């Protein structure tokens, strides 16, 4: 038996605006989990493999976000801030990137998927929807392990130089 340890996981702190797909992706690298493994631990089954793709066709319910909150130690009201606000239409096909800000905070911000967003206001730069050199479309944000293009291996921080 254990000598007086408290039950634990490699918890992670969320960044100031990352998407739920990106956060779950980091959580399941801090702990080595598969997408269906994290869904099974949370008790919500195969649901997590939709959310990592932004397949929010039926939206994340209060009861499902609370189930994830019991794993990841973030309350349901802070998990809701990683999803679009009520009636803010997102798009889940083109994954998009600022890249200039990815040097200030290495994350996929949820706001880059809003249908109303076309330029990052912190930097006044046009948002990217493909790698500026090889034209490859970005992987889903849960898979942003390297923080670079998967085809030509150019860092996302260097795509700051190639945009607008």
């Amino acid at each position: 038996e254990a000598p007086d340890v408290k039950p634990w996981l490699f918890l992670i702190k969320p960044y100031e605006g990352e998407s739920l797909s990106h956060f779950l992706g980091r959580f399941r690298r801090a702990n080595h989990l598969s997408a269906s493994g994290l869904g099974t631990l949370a008790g919500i089954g195969a649901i997590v493999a939709r959310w990592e793709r932004f397949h929010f066709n039926p939206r994340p319910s209060q009861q499902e976000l609370e189930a994830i909150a019991s794993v990841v130690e973030v309350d349901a009201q802070r998990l809701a801030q990683m999803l679009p606000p009520a009636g803010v239409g997102m798009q889940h096909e083109p994954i998009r990137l600022c890249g200039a800000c990815y040097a200030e905070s290495p994350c996929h911000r949820i706001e880059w998927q809003y249908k109303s967003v076309w330029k990052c206001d912190r930097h006044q730069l046009k948002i990217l929807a493909k790698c500026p050199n090889c034209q490859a479309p970005f992987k889903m944000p849960a898979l942003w392990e390297d923080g670079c293009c998967h085809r030509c291996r150019m860092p996302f921080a260097e795509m700051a130089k190639l945009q607008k």
Partner: protein
């Protein structure tokens, strides 16, 4: 007891074209009188609460449309045909909506009432035995039982001790010693939630649609969608849902609810003829096989017998009851009145064929008319009582008709019929005072020479379902199925079951209270599938497709009706009972008949 017989009607073009023009023009006020209720009428939600349409409202919407410039060109009987159809549309749809509302409430009760054994202990603050003791007291008070216990939970909350009344109700109105598995209870409570959800969805229904022949909405939408730009995804899809819609090709049928509004005659050539009230210029010729001709001769003999007798006999006993005149769809090219085929469908009360059967209808109507007059007892209401009393007097004067002694069966001998997925029927004939089965039949006996047709039906359903899939992927128009073969097999079994009931002089045939098996299975398989594919909704739907599909293809209501019809034409009583959950198909049939006999008192 009623049947429908049919004949094609033949005439020269001018007559088949003039009737089409009146039906293409009549088909339109059947649309406008729907809309005058579907959105125009303010009281509509009061009707949805009551479940019934007011008996005069459609006539009061139609009366001012009789002078409409679009609708004014039609006989007084074609407006009554419009009023009839639209009355029957709404009078059906409101009665569908009301039984759904009642089911949703009647299970919303039960989703509140259904609690685990641990929840009853918490809710009572007492032992599960104290609950068993109170459940035993409640059965002692009650001895309508299941309703009385439901009412005793709806009344009589009794310091939450209605917990024990729910304990009886979940145990099937009986005491139970066993304490239940929370996983089995979770599946059980989830089935009710699924039924509740499904009912709250089905509660909303598409407001009953008219058969538009004009294509005008479709043509306007086409030229809109191809020349303009939608402002929204909702508008772009609204045009798609219109452009995908297949438009009707046939007008609504004429309905003639008064038998005398068809007039029969014999042509010079010896053929029978017919004409309709308001269309008395357009003579039509009857064409039908000699297997059905005897009714069309009887129509003319009933009419001649009344006319030869100075109207002293009543059409209250005419063999014809009502006619529906319809254009059946033809094939290939030509004008609609040259391409389609006028067909007259006659409702006939089969027991009016014989004198011994006509006497049943004489007594049935004479009792109903007498009660009507005594319930009534104003100006036109007196004129209506003149119609009724001329009937109550005239109905005693007999038509000269064929004689055949009525069938009589033994009040103790019953035929039990057991229906299922693998065995569509199986039969046990029981002498209920001997408790002795006189005979059993399985399907291989019960349709004999035809037993190859069950194997044909299963081959044809499987073969044709795959061909329809292959055809849809190619947009081929070829789409076929085993529906007429299934209808024939259900009729072969219905004749054989009643021939067997006559053979053993049975007093009745017993049919199971199957109820809505399709919805029950759909909820059970869903509550289970949610435990095996959690979150993967596509996997939940794929769980037992062939079982759910075979239950949705299960023709039990059509076999039950086929047996009812043939039994009532023979004179054998129909009775009903609970079908056993366990036992062989024979044991099911045996216990079903004995249960229906026990229910006599």
């Amino acid at each position: 007891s009623q049947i429908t017989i049919q004949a094609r009607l033949i005439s020269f073009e001018s007559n088949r074209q003039q009737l089409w023009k009146l039906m293409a023009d009549l088909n339109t006020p059947l649309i406008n009188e729907l809309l005058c209720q579907l959105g125009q009428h303010p009281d509509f939600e009061k009707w949805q609460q009551k479940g019934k349409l007011p008996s005069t409202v459609v006539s009061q919407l139609c009366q001012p449309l009789k002078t409409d410039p679009r609708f004014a060109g039609q006989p007084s009987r074609l407006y009554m045909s419009a009023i009839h159809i639209v009355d029957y549309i709404y009078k059906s749809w409101l009665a569908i909506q009301k039984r759904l509302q009642q089911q949703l409430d009647g299970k919303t009760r039960w989703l509140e009432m259904l609690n685990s054994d641990a929840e009853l202990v918490e809710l009572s603050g007492d032992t599960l035995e104290a609950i068993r003791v109170k459940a035993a007291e409640i059965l002692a008070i009650a001895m309508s039982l299941s309703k009385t216990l439901f009412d005793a939970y709806q009344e009589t909350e009794d310091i939450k001790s209605r917990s024990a009344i729910s304990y009886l109700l979940k145990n099937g109105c009986k005491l139970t010693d066993k304490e239940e598995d929370s996983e089995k209870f979770a599946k059980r409570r989830r089935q009710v939630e699924i039924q509740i959800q499904r009912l709250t969805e089905k509660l909303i229904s598409r407001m009953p649609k008219g058969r538009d022949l004009t294509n005008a909405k479709w043509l306007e939408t086409l030229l809109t969608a191809t020349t303009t730009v939608a402002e929204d995804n909702a508008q772009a899809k609204r045009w798609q849902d219109i452009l995908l819609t297949r438009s009707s090709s046939l007008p609504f049928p004429l309905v003639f609810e008064t038998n005398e509004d068809m007039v029969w005659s014999k042509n010079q050539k010896g053929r029978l003829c017919v004409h309709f009230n308001g269309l008395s210029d357009l003579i039509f010729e009857v064409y039908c096989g000699n297997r059905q001709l005897h009714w069309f001769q009887r129509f003319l003999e009933d009419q001649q017998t009344k006319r030869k007798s100075k109207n002293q006999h009543s059409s209250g006993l005419f063999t014809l009851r009502n006619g529906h005149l319809v254009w059946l769809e033809g094939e290939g090219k030509g004008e609609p009145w040259n391409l389609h085929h006028l067909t007259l469908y006659c409702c006939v009360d089969n027991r009016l064929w014989t004198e011994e059967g006509t006497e049943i209808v004489r007594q049935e109507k004479a009792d109903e008319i007498t009660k009507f007059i005594t319930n009534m007892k104003s100006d036109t209401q007196q004129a209506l009582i003149q119609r009724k009393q001329s009937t109550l007097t005239r109905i005693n004067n007999s038509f000269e008709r064929p004689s055949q002694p009525l069938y009589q069966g033994q009040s103790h001998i019953l035929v039990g019929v057991s229906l299922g997925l693998e065995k569509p029927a199986t039969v046990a004939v029981v002498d209920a005072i001997a408790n002795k089965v006189l005979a059993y039949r399985s399907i291989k006996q019960l349709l004999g020479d035809n037993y190859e047709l069950l194997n044909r039906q299963r081959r044809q359903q499987q073969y044709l379902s795959h061909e329809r899939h292959k055809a849809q992927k190619n947009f081929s128009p070829n789409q076929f199925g085993a529906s007429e073969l299934g209808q024939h097999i259900d009729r072969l079994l219905a004749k054989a079951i009643v021939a067997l009931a006559r053979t053993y002089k049975a007093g009745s045939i017993v049919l199971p209270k199957l109820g809505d098996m399709r919805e029950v299975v759909q909820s059970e398989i869903q509550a289970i599938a949610e435990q095996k594919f959690p979150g993967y909704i596509e996997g939940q739907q794929k769980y037992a497709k062939q079982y759910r599909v075979n239950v949705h293809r299960w023709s039990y209501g059509r076999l039950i009706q086929s047996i009812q019809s043939k039994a009532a034409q023979t004179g054998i009583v129909i009775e009903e009972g609970k079908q056993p959950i366990r036992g062989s198909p024979h044991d099911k049939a045996k216990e079903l008949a004995l249960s229906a006999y026990n229910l006599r008192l």
